Design a binder for this molecule. Sequence first.
Ligand SMILES: [Zn+2]
Lengths: 18, 13, 108, 57
Amino acid sequence: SSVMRRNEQLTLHDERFE
Amino acid sequence: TFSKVQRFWESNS
Amino acid sequence: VNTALQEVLKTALIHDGLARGIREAAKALDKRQAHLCVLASNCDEPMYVKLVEALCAEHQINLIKVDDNKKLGEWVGLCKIPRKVVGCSCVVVKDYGQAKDVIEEYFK
Amino acid sequence: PKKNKHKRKKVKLAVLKYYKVISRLRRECPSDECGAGVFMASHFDRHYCGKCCLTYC
RNA sequence: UCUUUCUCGAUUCCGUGGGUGGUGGUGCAUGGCCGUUGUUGGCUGGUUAAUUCCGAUGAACG
Ligand SMILES: [Zn+2]
């Protein structure tokens, strides 16, 4: 897990990595 | 005194 | 009612429970595991238009009618990011993961 | 005799012929792995099924 | 492969460019690694004439 992100401008799919 | 025949029955290394 | 349908198909994509295509939709329908079905209204051949709700009523499955198919197809993830734009006429949500309650008491 | 690639025939609604109106037009496979939904292929002299080759002639 | 529809279903498949190009081929530099440039000790099994055949099964000194 990281600390920063792309922050804004929405999301499309959270992705299933597990 | 038993289970010696059971010990010898196990034929493996 | 479309936004609730959009979020329930989105969470179907999240949980990978939906089946795309009339073949996979019918296989989910007749095997008694389906929860809801979605049918596009922009169809030319009328042979498969009338039998889908017959299958839904025979197995006690609820149905939602949408006017467009390409919008339904790009919502359910038939496009890659989009260059290729394709749309489906029928899709069945076999299982779910707020507005789904709105959908289920809209059914009643 | 060039290396032509075979094209699958886009049959129009091959799904919508195993059910009427309710029941199954074709038979059901009695197999353990699958069945009752895997439609039983009935050709003009024979039969053909999906996975574990439960075939009747 | 040539007819007959059963199944897996995005893992897609048809054509065109002198523009890149790929299990590409080949030559140069390149990190590790083999080998290359003394002395003294120490048997469950089947099988054949035979401690027979196959089959599991260590240490110091210069
Ligand atoms: Zn069958």
